[PDB]
Symmetry: D2
Subunit: 237 residues, 4 copies
């Protein structure tokens, strides 16, 4: 039975690279989104033109019930989910002194609470079948802290604490949970940044996708509760 | 003036120990809570604390509370974000409410409480913000995906807020305690903690809250102005990295 | 121009797993050794693999320079360098001798300098390099009876970070791979009931790691998809240590 | 029954700051050096002008026998050593391309081997007595790596490996072992552009600040801090 992967924000700069890599690894891939049908349709179509057959689901990862409804559809089509990539999130940048409580919640409830809201929908299947791969997308900015992002940095760091506890809980049931923590990436939304990066360039979404593919393969069963940093050397210990 | 400290959860096991050390260091200490008797034993003890009610999960409650505090003291120089709770459960069994109660109180507290006092610390070019983490955010812990997520997130906050206040005479650090001899933990039967707890701690004993308070009293001094964005681990050797 | 890897301690439990993966990936592999390399080479040959092997004392700069002379002559160049060679000389710090200390410092840490020095200039010139240094989970958490081993392995990561910084603009990455307890012949010699009593409880995943798994992660690190990983410590320890 | 501290490099910018802090905390303090008697006796004089009596001792921390000799003297004089501060150290900066074996060896044999060479001479005392404090001085360059310092970064990183293991082995005998990891300091050395933009607080640390921290760790309120790395780097490095 084919391995199934669910990639939240699966149509993003990094979600779409991850999805393509996981499909090319031979998995049945579902991607999550909150966009209008035309966006989703054109995306699905061009992917179909590049040899790739995706199925997409609408979700609000900040909303538990919505995750429940989303998971329902996914499980009905693929019947199980083996590989979960918590990749969906948002930024709401403000200096701390300017930050509104609204800036704060949008980022906590979405970026961090997604660890509970989404992973809750799939964890029983993984434990039942004694197999799973959960990769939580962190950020270099949860490691080093960032100016203007007290909220996004608190969420990415919290994400690692969740990675570690889940790994401890699921280790003995064939499931590994890891944080992958990318630096700045040549995405669509993305001289104060580049000199920050020893390697002297943005990382490619596909590079991060490659590392993720490895973590979800059968060769990475001894990596759990780890933070994999892939940042162009922008941050070290 | 005189140095003024606000210890959220200031009457709790660690909070109490902390409030007493900042007091004995020459600070005028306000203690937050969610009372009368504790305050009696304390003035009695030799110290004068002012208690405020607050719900650190609730911004509004925080902002109201700061108003009383400041009305009374003029300023806040030293902020100890110590208030926290656990709602433990395996992930499989953890409810939306377990998860949520912990995020709001333990991690949202960082924004809510801190938002109230940052303004004056920057104006007065001085501040000591000390966020209480946990060794359980550092290494992770069974039954506590919520707690470890919240406590780990606190250090993202520490690190960003130390970067933003760096040139303003303010330091922001996390202190991560291991297992402490608070009244809760001392209720666990001797044989149970010798079986499940003490063998985790190379030093072979619970850490006193006073010790943690002593470390924090140091970080809040002028001598520690070059310590910022650090996580100081005081866990008896339970975790190293 | 088939990519070339050099693997110090290349016939050892983990070293051997590494050489096989890198060989199966299409890389030309040279392995280093400090007795029965004949036998090791023979068993590899039986398994369908061509390795060239080289004697060296990694703790000896002049020894490493001679070894690289021969390797470079043979293979033309080294694109991938695996500093895997390592010994332990365990003792409580109170019983440990200067010999226990020196043996581990020279072989495990000085080696980082002695070896990498030989191959660095070629990588800089070609504007491509991969360098992976093997650390240890005992570098990260420290370990009873291994003040020398922990010190050496911990020190390897200081090395990796500095060389990553220095080399990042010349197409070179440098990382540390820190493995947990692995099922090597040595360790498999342990009675299953001692392994179960004392070793496996430390490991949340509940088994030793297979030297091939660690080798697989390193093979990913050495590919054209790993260019944006550098100065990194990748822990592959089955949940034994987190931070 | 006063506590005795021994600070190697006890006359350097940081070393001297530390010795002053420990003395003012009530400790008898011995200091190690490898300087000529001229320099030493004068250093001693100004300190004594300030109302501090130190005893100073020659040692080569990169040399086991030397350390053994130095330590007998200390011990004959003060009877014991309760607190050890491994502070002595050097640098031999170069790019990896340019660094020589000698550059490498001088940094490793001195900065990292000192953990063994020095601490071996005092560890037994602490254990028998069931009380000790060992503070090993690392470096922010240990944590982040530093261009030009492949040797010194390795030595300084190596030092926490040592800290964690010895914290483990001694934790039941009332001893803590910690690394204190300072960023760039105001030492007559650095008071000799590139640096400060690295430091979020926008200034050099005072050696005295580092010494305050270490004075806390050596005190009786810090017995639950062990195997830890305390960073005091102005924000220069975080997690």
């Amino acid at each position: 039975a084919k391995r199934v992967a669910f990639v939240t924000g699966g149509m993003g700069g990094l979600g779409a690279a991850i999805s393509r890599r996981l499909h090319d690894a031979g998995m049945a891939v579902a991607v999550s989104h909150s966009e209008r049908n035309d966006h989703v349709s054109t995306w699905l179509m061009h992917e179909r033109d590049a040899g790739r057959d995706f199925k997409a689901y609408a979700v609000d990862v900040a909303d538990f019930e919505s995750c429940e409804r989303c998971a329902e559809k996914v499980l009905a089509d693929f019947g199980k989910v083996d590989v979960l990539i918590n990749n969906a999130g948002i930024t709401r940048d403000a200096t701390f002194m300017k930050m509104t409580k609204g800036d704060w919640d949008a980022v906590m409830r979405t970026d961090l609470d997604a660890m509970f809201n989404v992973t809750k929908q799939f964890i029983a299947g993984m434990v039942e079948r004694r197999f799973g791969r959960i990769v939580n997308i962190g950020s270099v900015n949860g490691s080093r802290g960032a100016f203007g992002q007290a909220n996004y940095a608190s969420a990415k760091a919290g994400i690692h604490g969740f990675t570690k506890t889940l790994a401890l809980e699921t280790a003995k049931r064939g499931i590994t949970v890891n944080t992958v923590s990318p630096g700045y990436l040549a995405t669509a939304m993305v001289a104060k940044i580049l000199p920050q990066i020893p390697v002297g360039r943005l990382g490619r979404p596909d590079e991060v996708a490659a590392l993720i593919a490895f973590l979800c393969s059968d060769d990475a069963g001894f990596v759990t509760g780890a933070d994999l940093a892939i940042n162009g050397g922008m941050h070290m210990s």
